[PDB]
Every structure is written in C-alpha cells, then in structure tokens.
Design a protein around this ligand. Structure first.
Ligand SMILES: Cc1cn([C@@H]2O[C@H](CSCCCCNCc3cccnc3C(C)(C)C)[C@@H](O)[C@H]2O)c2ncnc(N)c12
Length: 616
C-alpha cells in the first residue's frame, strides 16, 4: 500500500470520551488566555480545530508524516478553517522561529504518546519546545508558556498471563519426542523493544493481578529541568510485595495523564476505553512461581526515550538464542509438533518401515519452514533419516546443533540447506513448505514452490501440508467496524473527519487475534477454499459459496483461518488456542443487514496466493 493511515487513528477518533476531555482541556486553556497554539503531531488536525473553535488567535499544527499532513490539510479545509490553522509538514524539532513560526507560542498541545508513555519521544520534543518554541514558564496565560498534557503518573502491576508467556518463554523441555537442553536458553526480542503493547482488558485467557498496582514514575511536562535530568537520572530500585500465588509472566504498565488540574485521562485496562498497556515480559528466572511473602524486585529508568524495567527478580520471605515471539509461540504449539511427528512417521512407515525406530541410503527430509524450526530434529529422532534445516541465522544453527546433540545425533546428522534434489540422482521423501504467513494470509509463490517441490519427490513421497482448507464465518462486530472506520461526526464533536480518513482503509485486516475480538456469530464456520499442494487440479479459481444465515444481524466482517492437512487424518488449525499464526478478516465498507434462514452468496476468487472474498 502506497498511502497508509495507521489503524489506531480510527479507534482514537471514534473515542468520544477522549475527544471530549482533550477539547475540554483546550477550551479551558484557550479561554484562560492561551491564544497562540502549537499542535505537535497533529494527525488529522482534530486538536488544532478544537483550539481554533475555542477562540485561538493563531494555530500551528505540525505533522511528521506526509500522508497525515496532506489528510490534515484537507480535513481543516473541509471544516472551513484553512485561514485560521497553518499546517506544517515537518517534525516539531525542525521548527525554527521566525523562519517557520513567527513568534514563540503560549500553548503546546500533543498526543505523541504510546502505551509506555515515552515511546514516541514526548520528552525530546517537549525539551526542544521549551527551549525554542514556547514562551517562558509561569513564575495572564497569554504571557507564559504551558503544555497539554501537563503531567503523568506511571503505574505497574505484576501479572500472570499465559497468553503473554507463550510468546516470550519456551514452556516445555520435551516436544514431540525431542529434548530441548538446558545449555540452550531461548529469549524473546524484549530480553536484555523493551515492551509490547496489548489490549489487556480482552487478552485471550485473561490475566491475574499478583501484586497491587504501584507507582513506577511521575513526570512534569511543564518542568524543563526535570525533563532534561531524565537522561542521567539513576534507575529507581523498587520492591513490591506479592499478594496472590501465581506464575510471574509480566509487569503490566499504564499511566494517568493529567491534561490540566481538572481533566485527566487513564490508560488503565478497561473494555470501556481504547487504550493499550505496556507489557514488560518476565524471562531469564530460575523459578517463576511467586507467593504472598515474596517481593518482586525491578529497576525503573527512562534515560534513552523508552521507559525501562530491568533486573526483575524474586526475593523470598550456555548459548543464548534470540527468537521472535512468533517462533517462541511456535515452540509452545504442542499439537503442531505432535501432528508433524505422527504425519512424518506414517510416510516413513509406508515407504521404509525398517528405518522407523539400503542401510547406507537415508530417508531424505527437507524443511523449508521460514525462521526457527525443530521439525528436522523431530524427523531425525523418528528413524534412519537425513534431515535438512533451512535456518539462515548462525545463532539458530548453533542452537539446532546443540539440540541435535541432546537428541543423541552423531555430528552432521542434521544438515543445513532454491528447491533442488537432496543429492544428484536422489529424491526427497518429505518436503515441508511454509504455506500460511503469521499475518493470516497465504505465503507468496506457494503454488509455484509446491509445483517445483512435487517434481523432487520420491514415489509415495509427500509435500507437507498436502492441502489447506480456508474456513470463514459471518459476524456482527461493532469492534471491527470502529477499528476500520470513524463512525460519523458525533464522535468528533461535530467536526467532519470520517469521510476523509475512512478513504485510507484497506479491505483486509491482517494479524487479527480473532479469539480476543468481541463478535456475534451470524453463521456457522464453513469451508471457503481448498488450496491443494499435492493435487493442484483440485483447486478452484472462481467459486460461489452459499452461506446459511443462522442469526439476523448487521454483517460487518468475514473472519477467516485455515485447516492445514498434513494427511487425510492429521490437520492443524491456525485459529487454535496454541496457534502461532494470527487470523485475518474481510471488513465490509458498508455493513449488510442479513436475516436468519437466508443463504448469503460469497464470491471466492483464488489466483496463486491471493484470495478475494466479497458478498455477491
Ligand atoms: C514525535 C512526533 C510524532 N509526530 C506525529 O504524530 C503522531 C505521533 S504519535 C503515534 C501514534 C500514537 C498513538 N498512541 C495511542 C495510544 C496510547 C496509549 C495506549 N494505547 C494507544 C492506542 C491503543 C490507541 C494505540 C504521528 O502521526 C507522527 O507522524 C510528530 N509530528 C511532528 N513533530 C513531532 N515531533 C512528532
């Protein structure tokens, strides 16, 4: 996509409460005398229009992004405020007086905050603003400089959350007959990306508070000296008592943002708010079980942009292998590995049963999975197998050589691998291909790789998976609608933004965590498509699917996922609880009213790795 608008813009603009408190704070500050305003990171320009409507004499809005800047120019002009608001395509750090802005401003308004508060560089931007773009602070509001937000209190809480854990810690020491040795320590990219961002009010499986909430930091955005002192401030060593028995999985962080002395915003987890929380995963501990009487220790600092929580330990009453969170979720996906072990054993049993646990001829197995994979080690433990790994990273090879060694493989049993024959005049008995992206879409050129792979197979040899079924269902989801499009002008307090920003939406929502999404089912899930790697003649380009509507409702989306068939009996589900793949959905531009008992027709168009789903 050439012209992107980030998904969080739709969610935020749809949050009437957020828009109300920001407009209330700006109205109060403008009416009190702050007549010259600078909006840092204007987005659509909503805070600038609030300032001008409140009665500001001069409004300047700066926007880093070319796309957001151009959109903001059109929104402001459509709201008849072209003459009153001056939009600037620049980062606020590059603004010079009188070159870009003629005079120092009395009020800075900004929303350049993330779940961890500091992740968008609010400190660096406000230090530059106080030094070069703002009037002197208070010792009449027109005479002195002020910032919205005024201040913040940052909170933390130790939690048990199995959903976070399966993405940052490998939770088992034995997978599908293979041992994962102690001398190989797996760690996520958050180990020392200090935190991920999560909607903890709806996290799959939920979370449990193991401690009470605690203050981790405070910051005064109107205090330049306090802001400059952050770069060299020594970390704050804190000790938190444990109030509940449980597995320590993360420190969940949120903040209370004080816009002024009357108006405050909380990012505390709630299904009533749009705000996500900062999640600091707990890893590299000897024991994760914590009980009342224990103390959770950590070091909180904010010297180089991001808020950091380091040296996490529990105070009572070896090769390191960095993996992506998708690869850790993969190692924690037991049905995937057990399914692959059983499917590989059946191929070995049908082709060479004496090899299952020419004597010089091994059963050749190629794993073309993308990223870290242990499938070649599982294959090697099964029989007289010559397995090949496609890992690129040197650290991954070392780890796999140590895993191979722990599974009694003599040196160079496992080898590291364009699709070609194992050896000139030799054929593969098993080829594993990566068909579904973690995004929930089909991998690019998979049909082409399958066609090339089929020519390299021994008679009776198999490509894994053999075929993939795409499943989908009709849903009424107001949540998917509000994360895809701004719902009117009432949400944006009379301002016309929705028609202009809604144009930058994409038809397919990827990386969807379907189980955490509030949905009303309007149909039962049904097979939409068959992607056959062993028998492409069974594929269909153009198909109409008649979906029985079980329940009357407003159809807003068609979520979809897959059943990957390793053979006729063994299938993997990309929507399963332990799945390391995310799902996806076709979200409708205009929701359709459907009635119980009708057969809705979906048009499913398949060309190579593309699938188009529309209501016919
Ligand atoms: C530093 C800077 C940024 N920019 C521009 O402004 C925006 C930066 S902010 C990034 C998104 C923040 C959303 N945070 C919401 C949130 C918070 C907490 C919890 N949950 C959320 C949810 C769940 C809702 C995402 C962006 O348009 C940039 O191009 C600037 N332009 C001019 N000069 C500058 N110095 C800047």
């Amino acid at each position: 996509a050439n012209w992107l608008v980030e998904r969080w813009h739709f969610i935020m603009l749809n949050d009437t409460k957020r828009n109300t408190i920001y407009n209330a704070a700006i109205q109060k500050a403008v009416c009190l005398g702050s007549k010259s305003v600078l909006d840092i990171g204007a987005g659509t320009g909503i805070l600038s229009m609030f300032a001008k409507k409140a009665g500001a004499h001069s409004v300047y809005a700066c926007e880093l992004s070319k796309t957001m800047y151009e959109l903001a120019c059109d929104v402001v002009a459509a709201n008849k405020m072209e003459a009153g608001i001056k939009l600037l395509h620049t980062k606020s750090l590059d603004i010079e007086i009188p070159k870009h802005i003629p005079e120092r401003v009395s009020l800075v308004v900004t929303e350049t905050v993330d779940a961890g508060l500091f992740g968008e560089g609010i400190v660096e931007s406000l230090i530059h603003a106080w030094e070069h773009l703002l009037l002197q602070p208070k010792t009449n509001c027109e005479k002195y400089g002020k910032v919205i937000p005024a201040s913040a209190v940052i909170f933390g809480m130790a939690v048990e959350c199995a959903e976070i854990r399966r993405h940052h810690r490998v939770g088992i020491k034995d997978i599908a007959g293979i041992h994962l040795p102690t001398n190989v320590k797996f760690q996520s990219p958050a180990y020392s990306e200090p935190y991920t961002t999560e909607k903890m009010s709806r996290v799959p499986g939920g979370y449990l508070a193991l401690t009470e909430c605690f203050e981790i930091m405070t910051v005064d955005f109107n205090n330049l000296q306090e802001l400059k002192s952050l770069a060299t401030k020594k970390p704050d060593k804190i000790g938190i008592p444990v109030i509940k028995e449980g597995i320590l999985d993360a420190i969940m962080v949120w903040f209370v943002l004080q816009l002024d002395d009357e108006h405050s915003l909380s990012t505390s987890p709630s299904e009533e708010t749009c705000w996500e929380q900062a999640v600091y995963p707990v890893q590299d501990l000897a024991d994760y079980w914590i009980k009342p009487g224990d103390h959770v220790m950590m070091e909180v600092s904010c010297q180089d942009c991001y808020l950091r929580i380091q040296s996490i330990s529990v105070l009572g009453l070896e090769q390191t292998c960095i993996l992506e969170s998708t690869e850790i979720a993969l190692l924690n996906n037991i049905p995937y590995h057990e399914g692959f072990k059983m499917a590989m054993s059946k191929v070995l049993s049908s082709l060479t049963p004496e090899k299952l646990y020419n004597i010089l001829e091994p059963f050749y197995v190629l794993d073309v999975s993308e990223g870290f994979s242990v499938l070649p080690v599982i294959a090697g433990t099964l029989g007289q197998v010559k397995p090949y790994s496609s890992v690129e990273k040197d650290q991954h090879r070392i780890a796999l050589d140590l895993i191979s060694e722990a599974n009694h493989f003599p040196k160079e049993t496992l080898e590291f691998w364009m699709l070609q024959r194992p050896k000139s005049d030799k054929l593969w008995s098993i080829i594993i291909l990566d068909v579904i992206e973690p995004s929930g879409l089909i991998q690019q050129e998979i049909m082409e790789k399958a066609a090339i792979s089929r020519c390299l197979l021994q008679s009776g040899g198999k490509i894994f998976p053999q075929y993939v079924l795409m499943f989908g269902l009709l849903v009424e989801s107001q949540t998917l609608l509000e994360e895809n499009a701004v719902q009117g002008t009432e949400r944006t307090l009379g301002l016309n933004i929705a028609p202009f920003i809604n144009q930058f939406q994409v038809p397919i929502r990827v990386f969807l965590d379907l189980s955490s999404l509030p949905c009303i089912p309007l149909s039962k899930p049904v097979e939409l498509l068959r992607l056959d790697l062993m028998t492409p003649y069974l594929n269909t380009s153009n198909r109409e699917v008649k979906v029985y509507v079980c329940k009357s409702g407003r159809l807003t989306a068609i979520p979809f996922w897959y059943h990957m068939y390793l053979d006729e009996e063994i299938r993997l589900d990309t929507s399963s609880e332990a799945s390391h793949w995310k799902q996806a959905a076709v979200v409708l531009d205009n929701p359709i009213q459907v009635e119980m008992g009708e057969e809705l027709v979906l048009s499913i168009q398949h060309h190579k790795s593309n699938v188009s789903i529309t209501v016919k």
